[PDB]
Amino acid sequence: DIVMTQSQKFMSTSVGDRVSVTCKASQNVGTHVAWYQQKPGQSPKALIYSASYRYSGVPDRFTGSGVGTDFTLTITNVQSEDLAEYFCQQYNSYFTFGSGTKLEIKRADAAPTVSIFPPSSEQLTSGGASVVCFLNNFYPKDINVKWKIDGSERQNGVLNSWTDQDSKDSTYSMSSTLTLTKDEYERHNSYTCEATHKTSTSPIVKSFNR
Amino acid sequence: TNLCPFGEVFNATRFASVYAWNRKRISNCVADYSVLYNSASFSTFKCYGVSPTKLNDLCFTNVYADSFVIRGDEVRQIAPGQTGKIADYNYKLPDDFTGCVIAWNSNNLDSKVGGNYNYLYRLFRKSNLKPFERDISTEIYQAGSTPCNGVEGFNCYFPLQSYGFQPTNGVGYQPYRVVVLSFELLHAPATVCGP
Amino acid sequence: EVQLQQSGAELVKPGASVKLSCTTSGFNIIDTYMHWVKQRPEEGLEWIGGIDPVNGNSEYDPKFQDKATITADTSSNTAYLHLSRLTSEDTAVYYCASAHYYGSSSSFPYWGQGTDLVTVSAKTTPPSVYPLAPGSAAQTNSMVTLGCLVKGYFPEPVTVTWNSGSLSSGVHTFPAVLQSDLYTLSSSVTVPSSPWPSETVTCNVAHPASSTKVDKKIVPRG
Ligand SMILES: *[C@@H]1O[C@H](CO)[C@@H](O)[C@H](O)[C@H]1NC(C)=O
């Protein structure tokens, strides 16, 4: 087995800056090395072959370098759409892949846009009541959501999920869902989602009444 | 004595179309280039960055052998720094190429009286090939501003075209088999040497 | 554009078998090798094997030779991966990929979109899809945000599109969360307040492992 080692699990950069991803082969592989880009949710896309040749159609800000055991993928003038994991591969003896280096883009802060949604009538008729809060296009990733029912905090029944960095503006988004039974939902009137983010000392509050 | 299997390359039963050029990796063997250079059957034997009479005194980490068929007048395109449909759209050597280009007339095997149309070349491409890039795509080429919707038509061309080899053709339109030997010199152990 | 189109996600019982397909559009597979690659979150990308569609010869990583079989049909431009006697270690995304060169090994220039295989004894559960309508984020935003809640399905994945993909900008689909053996996810779409509810906005959900789909129009509440 030839092992391809990518020691960097994550790297950070800014739009317009440059970054270099490293790969080390456990044996000499000459120039039988390729590089691939994998955006979240998607399949790998080919970038480099023979260690340093770019395919037609691949932007010229991607460059491969190295011979032997030490290889580098360099990305210059980094764009938000370069948010991806980057994998090396050797094809000198069979085919083995590195463990991937995930790129993170640093950008300016951005307050979240918050929206709250009552349960669908269709869900209620089935006995359930999920109230959903979206916190969209904020930066940096760190954020707090607090659910309130008739003025008092609620923790049980809340599930949250964050996107990966957006490939167009490099912001994060987050989804928070408070699930409970229909009857519990009908026992209270006020439902509120409150988001606290370093872009403002005052929380962002959105609410509704049945 | 483990000789490099040159015969498998030069006397392969079939040869690829140039757009789909084949590459063989040659490693861990003894290469007697002099048998190749001393073979009169080769109409072309042009080396770059090495001298053909001294090939048997040199060692490489790997040798690659690319092979395909083109017509006579295109053999001159199989060289660094060349332009034209073959060099731009089918098989491109790098400027710093180190190796040898070998060709010979294959009219007796690749032509037929009813015309042989099985060998193809790419006639249209949106960009020039990068060195040693290989394009096997079949998508309709949009020559104008109208999208083609995957259908051939006006300004909407199938990108590959047949040579049409028949023995009667002039030499410049007769088939030539080509083998390009690329000599890789890395600073790692050599695995392909002369005797 | 060249596309390797793979078959849908599959739920497979432990011990059973499955056959994945990959159909190429934009080149003939007979001009290259077709490979299959496995991906899991912790173990990474692993090459399974590959095939020479001209002669039918396939070759495998020895770790996969007893359970993987790769075949190809050049007349339909399709490559297949057969996996037998599946275990939980076979839960993974499987990709088809093509090779650059023919005659020797090379990089993989084109990849299919991937097929999630889930090995479990649980049955498939299609999602319930619920519209998310305002929801007193009241005008006046120039923008209005709607969503769809895709609740209680198994296994992954579901795909969510909005107006059949014509609204791709301003869409965020959030990763699913697993609770009591069922997945739930949400998707949001932001459009100007002039189009909605003036114009229709619909989320299109597909759950390939149960072979089900749902469209849900987002209509103003009451
Ligand atoms: C090709 O075959 C002939 C015999 O028909 C043989 O003399 C020649 O050496 C072969 N070519 C190579 C490169 O081995």
Count of structural domains within chain A? 2
Residues C37 and C139 in one domain: no
Contact B43, B59 (CB under 8 A): no
Which tokens hold the place of A52? 């340093």
CB–CB contact C113 A43 (8 Å): yes
Residues C135 and C49 in one domain: no
* CATH value at residue C49: 2.60.40.10
Residues of C in contact with B131 (CB under 8 A): none
3-state secondary structure of A25: strand
- Residue-number span of the structural domain to which C67 is assigned: 3-119
Residues C115, C21, single domain; the answer is: yes
Q: Are residues C153 and C54 in the same domain?
A: no
Provide the residue ranges of all domains of chain B, joining segments of one domain with +: 2-114+167-184, 115-166
Question: What CATH number has the domain bearing residue A36?
Answer: 2.60.40.10
- State whether C204 and C111 are in the same domain: no
Q: Which of B2, B20, B24, B30 is nearest to B11 (CA)?
A: B24
Give the Cα separation of B6 and B30 in Å (integer).
10
Verify that C107 and C177 share a domain, yes or no.
no
Mutate to test the interface with A, among C94, C132, C169, C187 (most CBs of A within 10 A): C132
Buried b / exposed e over C137-173, threshold 16 CB at 10 Å, is beeeeebbbbbbbbbbbbbbbbbbbbbeeebeebbbb
Helix (H) or strand (E) holding A123: helix A121-125
Pairing type for strands A144-149 and A190-196 reads: antiparallel
Same-domain check for residues C12 and C111: yes
Residue C113 sits in the same domain as residue C167: no
**Pair C138, C61 in one domain:** no
Tokens of A175: 């989804």
Answer whether B61 touches A (CB < 8 Å).
Answer: yes
- Phi and psi of A102, rounded to 5°? -90, 130
The pocket around ligand 1, CB under 6 angstroms, is made up of B 6-7, 10-11
- Domain ends where: A106, A129, A147? A106
Domain count, chain C: 2
* Shared-domain flag, residues C48 and C133: no
- Longest CA–CA span in chain A (Å) reads 70
Give pairs for B90-93: CB < 8 Å, separation 24+: B90/B18, B90/B19, B90/B21, B90/B121, B90/B122, B90/B129, B90/B135, B91/B18, B91/B21, B91/B66, B91/B129, B91/B180, B92/B128, B92/B129, B92/B130, B92/B131, B92/B132, B92/B133, B93/B131, B93/B132, B93/B180
Residue C154 Cα to chain centre, angstroms: 14
The two structure tokens encoding residue C161:
């599109």
Q: Is B109 on the interface with C (CB under 8 A)?
A: no
Q: How far apart are CA C9 and CA A128, in angstroms?
A: 28
Q: Which residue owns the Cα nearest ligand 1 atom 2? A: B11
Q: Is B25 on the interface with C (CB under 8 A)?
A: yes
Boundary of a domain, candidates C119, C150, C175? C119
Domain that includes residue A204, residue range: 113-209
Q: Which of A30, A50, A54 sits opposite B188 (nearest CB)?
A: A30
- Based on the domain organization, do A145 and A93 belong to the same domain? no
Way it was determined: X-ray
* C26/C98 same-domain check: yes
Q: Is residue A63 helix, strand or coil?
A: strand
Domain boundary among C86, C119, C152: C119
Tell me which residue of A205, A10, A13, A21 sits closest to A116, measured CA to CA: A205
From C119, C147, C182, the end of a domain falls on C119
CB proximity C136 to A under 8 Å: yes
Resolution in Å equals 1.9
